[PDB]
RNA sequence: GCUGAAAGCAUCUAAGCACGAAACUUGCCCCGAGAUGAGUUCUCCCUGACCCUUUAAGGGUCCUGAAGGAACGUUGAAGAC
RNA sequence: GAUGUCGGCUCAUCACAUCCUGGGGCUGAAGUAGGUCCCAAGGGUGAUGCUGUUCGCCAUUUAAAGUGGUACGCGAGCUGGGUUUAGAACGUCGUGAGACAGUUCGGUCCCUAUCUGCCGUGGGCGCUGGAGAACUGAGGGGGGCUGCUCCUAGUACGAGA
RNA sequence: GUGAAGAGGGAAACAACCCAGACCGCCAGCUAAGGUCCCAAAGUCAUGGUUAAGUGGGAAACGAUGUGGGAAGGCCCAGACAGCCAGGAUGUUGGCUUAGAAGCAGCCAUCAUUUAAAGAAAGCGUAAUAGCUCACUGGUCGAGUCGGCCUGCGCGGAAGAU
């Protein structure tokens, strides 16, 4: 469950450190974004010589939440923090080239094959 | 369809017909001569 | 088509071999005993009246007892009617069992929902609560305005207000039939159904499909 | 009126049956009947039909003219009937008749099957041609219109179902 | 749109015959015979006297009280009561 | 011998001069898109930065972010930031006391509901001998929104995009 | 003039509008304004017209083959109006700027002359003649036809919030 003003960690090597959800996009009055959902964010903190700057507005995909995901089994997978991956604003493709920390099975959608391939686990 | 208070013939081929209490102009040559009075 | 009267036994899961858990409601459908057949000539419409379960002989009055004796069936805990379609016919004294639903795969379950008592507008009608702070005076869960002014001069009929909630007959439509177990008198439907455990349920084939 | 003045000639082999207002025509092609308006006098004579207004009916002449036209069409109906020819224009547009049903392939994602009425028979010389035959002028015209409505002739290439004797008057988009 | 005069032609309209929208009326769900216009089916139960008069769809008396219902009590995933 | 003002809040209801979705004619309508007009109220029609603000402008959504009426709907429902008491200062004006739809800071919002109106919940009688159930349906209400992807199909179209 | 300072009848209700001013009583009559199918008293009245929208029973400039009349016209039975087999001797690629739009670029020759009548173009796409109708008027069909005027009553224009 990610909503406006939620702070996120960054799960790739794009350069950002902290981002804040600006809009849960993909519907009117839509409230939350789970894993696999696309959100618009602003960058609150970045490393000195990254590919992105502080204050940039662009899209991202949520890959880890500490609310978690549920499997058809009824089981649930929770994480310790909320993480996302930065995407180009127009072509929703990852900015970075390395993916940090595990991701989850819900990203296998032919749109996030880069993240699945680059991820360390699951 | 032109909806007007003043419907008139616009060329030789346009004709006045009253259908169900409505004055109408139907024209066999120019489609944009269709008119109903409303 | 007709349906059957059962009772809500409880709720559990079914695990499928491909690792899916199906939340099911267990409905015990004993034999339904036809106590009266209503026809167009005598009653003006076509339907059957059924009974199920059992009742203590001391709790059945001689009006009810005589009605049951005419059908030649044992006393049940109640009577329900099912409207008959053009095709089917039944005879008084016939018993209908759960394998009626052997090939149905969608049912409509009707029951009496759990009674919430006198409920406020926030619970009953999802009204938004007002400010918890910022000067709010004694008005944290009250409904707010209820009308306009002199021009209507009255509260419009059907206004949403606090009152009795629940304890009324509710139908849930298009439930998957997961299992029919004739020898155990069990019907398993996917999802939740109205009413508390042990309450009467009316199960009918889905009307919308 | 002065259309109704001209009597309709009843040829050989066709007979007339009158019950005041309802009239019956029988010929080699078959059976036709209708009830005329209450303001028209149907009057059979020596192998002719003559039509005139009643009394106390305003606009009895207009009704008489309509009745004359309808009965004329009936007589021409029970003999040699009527025919309507439809054409299909456009790549992949095809027609085929299967007994009492016309199958049309007009570029849709689904098949189009049209059920004919009682008195109408269809026959497709080519896949771009639909020939209709029947006794009733109104019914055959209605069926032709219904077939045409599936794919009306669009004004840029004339593609669609058209009457054989129809003018389309295409046009160009802007220029070039 | 079809056939079709008035108004040889024509013309969806005048006779007549078709269509056509998240509107309408249904269909899905709930309440519901104080629906005073108070309806319906099945079943259960009561077929003793006497007296007085204004007499009338009358009132008492004695014997009788049925089907059922209530009360009281153990209570309730029912419920302010 | 008193009909509380603005804005927000909570709750609304209606009109149609319909924002979206639906139907259709004309196009200077190839398609993709439109434009314009007609019909149509069934449902739906953003949450934020600044400002007391309605508004406005932004930054991002969305199918769309309709327009009006309702004492500019709604304070015996709520708030009280603004305006509009009494304290104080500034700019200006007046000799001054004081003033100023100029500004600034701080500044007591009572109401135990009789009647109608509405939401719930019960009794009394009637229903023509009483009773236990089960019914019917004459009317009332409710719901009635839409995206994206894929196939049809790179097919029709264009000349190509 | 009326209310004020006046009742009553009528106007659905409605000080000031209409008729008509109330001394009192009557289960008497007769009338005025308004009415006479029913609510609700009295014409389901007689005789002729006129309207079809529910006009009546709410709206303008402005539109229209909606109908009831009137007074005048033109055309025409040799034949009108229409329908139809209707096309036809144009020097015509006779003046476009240029080697055909000779017509309809824009202006100018813009005329003789034909068929029986036609075209120096009136257009439409085409700046084109190309193609098309044509005002053609040659035949055929046989009684009406085509406009204006004046008036009667209807139609559209015509969207609101319980």
Which residues is A84 bridged to in the sheet?
A: A10, A62
Q: What separation, in Å, do the N-terminal and C-terminal C-alpha atoms of chain D show?
A: 54
Q: Do A73 and C19 touch (CB under 8 A)?
A: yes
Minimal-distance CA residue of chain C relative to A71? C20
Assigned token pair, C1: 């088509």
φ, ψ dihedrals at D146, nearest 5° = -65, -45
Report the distance separating Cα D45 and Cα C158, nearest Å: 74
Which residues is C175 bridged to in the sheet?
A: C107
Report the distance separating Cα C30 and Cα C25, nearest Å: 16
Report the distance separating Cα D168 and Cα D145, nearest Å: 15
Assigned token pair, C200: 């009467």
In the 3-class helix/strand/coil scheme, how is D39-65 assigned residue by residue?
CEEEEECCCEEEEEECCCCCCHHHHHH
Q: Do A72 and C21 touch (CB under 8 A)?
A: yes
Report the distance separating Cα D3 and Cα B28, nearest Å: 25
**Is B touching C (3+ C-beta pairs, cut-off 8 A)?**
no
Which residues is C205 bridged to in the sheet?
A: C107
Contact B9, B30 (CB under 8 A): no
Neighbours of D9 (CB within 10 A): 10
Chains with 3+ CB–CB pairs under 8 A to C are A
- Residues of chain A contacting C21 with CB distance shorter than 8 Å: 72-74
Best of C14, C17, C20 to substitute, by most chain A Cβ atoms within 10 angstroms, is: C20
- Positions in chain F where some atom is under 7 Å from a protein CB: 9-13, 24-30, 37-39, 45-48, 59-65, 70-71, 73-75, 77-80, 109-110, 116-121, 131-137, 141-142, 147, 152-153, 155-159
For residue C185, how far is the Cα from the chain centroid? 18
Neighbours of A113 (CB within 10 A): 11
Of residues D137, D101, D104, the one with CA closest to residue D117: D101
Contact D156, D171 (CB under 8 A): yes
Of residues D85, D82, D72, D71, the one with CA closest to residue D128: D85
The integer distance in angstroms from the CA atom of C143 to the C1' atom of F101 is 38
Tell me if the domain spanning D8-78 has CATH number 3.90.930.12.
yes
Establish if A73 touches chain C: CB-CB under 8 angstroms. yes
Report the distance separating Cα B29 and Cα C166, nearest Å: 69
Minimal-distance CA residue of chain A relative to C15? A73
Report the distance separating Cα C140 and Cα C133, nearest Å: 9
Contact C74, C60 (CB under 8 A): no
Assigned token pair, D118: 């009682």
Task: Determine if residue C21 is left, alpha or beta; phi over 0 gives left, psi from -120 to 50 gives alpha, anything else beta.
Answer: beta
- CA of C9 vs chain A CAs: smallest distance (Å): 22
Report the distance separating Cα C81 and Cα D135, nearest Å: 56
The per-residue DSSP string of chain D comes to: -TTTSSPEE--TT-EEEEETTEEEEE-SS-EEEEEPPTTEEEEE-SSEEEEEE-SS-TTHHHHHHHHHHHHHHHHHHHTT-EEEEEEEESTT-EEEEETTEEEEESS-SS-EEEE--TT-EEE-SSTTEEEEEES-HHHHHHHHHHHHHTS---TTT--EEEETT-------SS--
Of residues D141, D100, D137, the one with CA closest to residue D121: D100
Q: What separation, in Å, do the N-terminal and C-terminal C-alpha atoms of chain B show?
A: 11
The pairs formed by D15-22 with CB atoms below 8 angstroms and a separation of 24 or more are: D16/D44, D16/D49, D18/D42, D18/D44
Neighbours of A3 (CB within 10 A): 13
For residue C114, count CB atoms less than 10 angstroms from its CB and return exposed for 0-12, middle for 13-18, buried for 19 or more: middle
Neighbours of D19 (CB within 10 A): 10
Contact D21, D35 (CB under 8 A): yes
- Positions in chain G where some atom is under 7 Å from a protein CB: 53, 60-66, 144, 155-158, 162
Report the distance separating Cα D134 and Cα D77, nearest Å: 8
Report the distance separating Cα A58 and Cα A88, nearest Å: 7
- CA of A69 vs chain C CAs: smallest distance (Å): 15
Of residues A47, A46, A52, A35, the one with CA closest to residue A87: A52
Biggest alpha carbon distance in chain A? Answer: 44
The integer distance in angstroms from the CA atom of A47 to the C1' atom of F161 is 42
Which nucleotide is closest to C164, CA to C1'? F120
- Placement of tokens 């007589």 in the chain: D75
How do strand B35-37 and strand B2-4 relate by DSSP bridges? parallel
Minimal-distance CA residue of chain C relative to A75? C21
Q: How was this structure determined?
A: cryo-EM
The integer distance in angstroms from the CA atom of C3 to the C1' atom of E28 is 18
In the 3-class helix/strand/coil scheme, how is chain C assigned residue by residue?
CCCEEEEEEEEEEEEECCCEEEEEEEEECCCEEEEEEECHHHHCCCEEEEECCCCCHHHCCHHHHHHHHHHCCCCCCCCEEEECCCCCCCCCCCEECHHHHCCCCEEEEEEECCCCEEECHHHHHCCCCCCCCCCCCCCCCCCCCCCCCCCCCCCCCCCCCCEEECCCEEEEEEEEEEEEECCCCEEEEECCCCCCCCCEEEEEECCCC
**Secondary structure element (H or E) that encloses residue A114, with its range:** helix A113-118
Give me the half-sphere count of Cα atoms (radius 13 Å) on the Cβ side of residue C163.
Answer: 5
**Helix, strand, coil content of chain B in percent (nearest 5):** 10, 45, 45
Neighbours of C123 (CB within 10 A): 12
Assigned token pair, C125: 């009608």
Q: Do A73 and C21 touch (CB under 8 A)?
A: yes
Its sign, for the CA torsion A95, A101, A102, A103, is: negative
Superfamily of domain D82-163: Ribosomal protein L6 (3.90.930.12)
Neighbours of A53 (CB within 10 A): 10
Of residues C207, C209, C199, the one with CA closest to residue C5: C199
**Secondary structure element (H or E) that encloses residue A18, with its range:** strand A16-24
Minimal-distance CA residue of chain A relative to C16? A73
For residue C114, how far is the Cα from the chain centroid? 11
Q: Do A74 and C19 touch (CB under 8 A)?
A: no
Biggest alpha carbon distance in chain D? Answer: 67
- Positions in chain E where some atom is under 7 Å from a protein CB: 1-18, 28-31, 40-45, 67-69, 77-80
- How far, CA to CA in Å, does D175 sit from each of D171, D172? 10, 7
Neighbours of A102 (CB within 10 A): 15
Domain boundaries, chain D: 8-78, 82-163
- CA of A48 vs chain C CAs: smallest distance (Å): 43
Of residues D128, D3, D110, D9, the one with CA closest to residue D53: D3
Neighbours of C78 (CB within 10 A): 13
- DSSP letter assigned to residue B18: E
Establish if A27 touches chain C: CB-CB under 8 angstroms. no
The per-residue DSSP string of A32-80 comes to: -B-TT-EEEEEEEEE-TTSSS-TT-EEEEEEEE-SS-EE-TTS-EE--S
Report the distance separating Cα A14 and Cα C187, nearest Å: 56
Helix axes D60-78, D137-149, angle to 10 degrees: 80
- Residues of chain A contacting C13 with CB distance shorter than 8 Å: 74
Size of interface A-C (CB pairs under 8 A): 8
Report the distance separating Cα D170 and Cα D173, nearest Å: 10
Assigned token pair, C139: 């008005």
Contact C194, C96 (CB under 8 A): no
- Residues of chain A contacting C20 with CB distance shorter than 8 Å: 72-73
Report the distance separating Cα D40 and Cα D42, nearest Å: 6
- DSSP letter assigned to residue A22: E
In our burial notation (b when 16+ CB lie closer than 10 A, e otherwise), range D63-75 reads: bbbbbbebbbbbb
Assigned token pair, C38: 């209503």
Report the distance separating Cα A46 and Cα C23, nearest Å: 46
Rg (C-alpha) for chain C, rounded Å, is 23
Contact C41, C77 (CB under 8 A): no
Of residues C180, C178, C196, the one with CA closest to residue C8: C196
Resolution, angstroms, 1 dp = 2.2
Of residues C123, C110, C127, C107, the one with CA closest to residue C168: C110
- How far, CA to CA in Å, does D87 sit from each of A5, D44, D131, D148? 65, 41, 9, 9
- How far, CA to CA in Å, does D49 sit from each of C38, D24, D33, D134? 61, 12, 15, 23
φ, ψ dihedrals at A105, nearest 5° = -65, -25
Report the distance separating Cα D126 and Cα D88, nearest Å: 10
Which nucleotide is closest to C156, CA to C1'? F118
Neighbours of C2 (CB within 10 A): 19
For residue D169, count CB atoms less than 10 angstroms from its CB and return exposed for 0-12, middle for 13-18, buried for 19 or more: exposed
Domain boundaries, chain A: 1-122
Contact A94, A87 (CB under 8 A): yes
φ, ψ dihedrals at D4, nearest 5° = -70, -20
Which residues is C171 bridged to in the sheet?
A: C110
Report the distance separating Cα A8 and Cα A41, nearest Å: 9
């Amino acid at each position: 469950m990610i909503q406006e003003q939620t702070m996120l960690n960054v799960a790739d090597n794009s350069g950002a450190r902290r981002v804040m959800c600006i809009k849960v996009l993909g519907g009117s009055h839509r409230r939350y974004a789970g894993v696999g959902d696309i959100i618009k964010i602003t960058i609150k903190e970045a490393i000195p010589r990254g590919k992105v700057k502080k204050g940039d507005v662009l899209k991202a995909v949520v890959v880890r939440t500490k609310k978690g995901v549920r499997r058809p089994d009824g089981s649930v997978i929770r994480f310790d923090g909320n993480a996302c991956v930065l995407l180009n604003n127009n072509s929703e493709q990852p900015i970075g080239t390395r993916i940090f920390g595990p991701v989850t099975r819900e990203l296998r959608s032919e749109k996030f094959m880069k993240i699945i391939s680059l991820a360390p686990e699951v | 369809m032109k909806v007007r208070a003043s419907v008139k013939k616009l060329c030789r081929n346009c004709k006045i017909v009253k259908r169900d209490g409505v004055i109408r102009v139907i024209c066999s040559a120019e489609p944009k001569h269709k008119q109903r009075q409303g | 088509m007709i349906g059957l009267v059962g009772k809500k036994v409880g709720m559990t899961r079914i695990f499928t071999e491909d690792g899916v858990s199906i939340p099911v409601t267990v409905i015990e459908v004993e034999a339904n005993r036809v106590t009266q057949v209503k026809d167009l000539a005598n009653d003006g419409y076509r339907a059957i009246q059924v009974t199920t379960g059992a009742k203590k002989a001391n709790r059945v009055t001689k009006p009810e007892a005589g009605h049951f004796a005419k059908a030649g069936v044992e006393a049940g805990r109640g009577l329900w009617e099912f409207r008959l379609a053009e095709g089917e016919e039944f005879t008084v004294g016939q018993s209908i069992s759960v394998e009626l639903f052997a090939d149905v795969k969608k049912v409509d379950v009707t029951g009496t929902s759990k009674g919430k008592g006198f409920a406020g507008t926030v619970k009953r009608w999802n009204f938004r609560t007002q400010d918890a702070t910022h000067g709010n005076s004694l008005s944290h869960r009250v409904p707010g305005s209820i009308g306009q002014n002199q021009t209507p001069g009255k509260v419009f009929k059907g206004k949403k207000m606090a009152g009795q909630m629940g304890n009324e007959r509710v139908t849930v439509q298009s439930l998957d039939v997961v299992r029919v177990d004739a020898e155990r008198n069990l019907l398993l439907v996917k999802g939740a159904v109205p009413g508390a455990t042990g309450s009467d349920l009316i199960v009918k084939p889905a009307v919308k499909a | 009126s002065r259309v109704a003045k001209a009597p309709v000639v009843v040829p050989a082999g066709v007979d007339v049956k009158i019950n005041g207002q309802v009239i019956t025509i029988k010929g080699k092609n078959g059976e036709l009947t209708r009830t005329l308006n209450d303001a028209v006098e149907v009057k059979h004579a020596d192998n002719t039909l003559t039509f005139g207004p009643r009394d106390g009916y305003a606009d009895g002449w207009a009704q008489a003219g309509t009745a004359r036209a309808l009965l004329n069409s009936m007589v021409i109906g029970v003999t040699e009937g009527f025919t309507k020819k439809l054409q299909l224009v456009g790549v992949g547009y095809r027609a085929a008749v299967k007994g009492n049903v016309i199958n049309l392939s007009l570029g849709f994602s689904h098949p189009v099957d049209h059920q004919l009425p009682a008195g109408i028979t269809a026959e497709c010389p080519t896949q771009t041609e639909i020939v209709l035959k029947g006794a009733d002028k109104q019914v055959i015209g209605q069926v032709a219109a219904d077939l045409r409505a599936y794919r009306r002739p669009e004004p840029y290439k004339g593609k669609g179902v058209r009457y054989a004797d129809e003018v389309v008057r295409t046009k160009e988009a802007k220029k070039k």
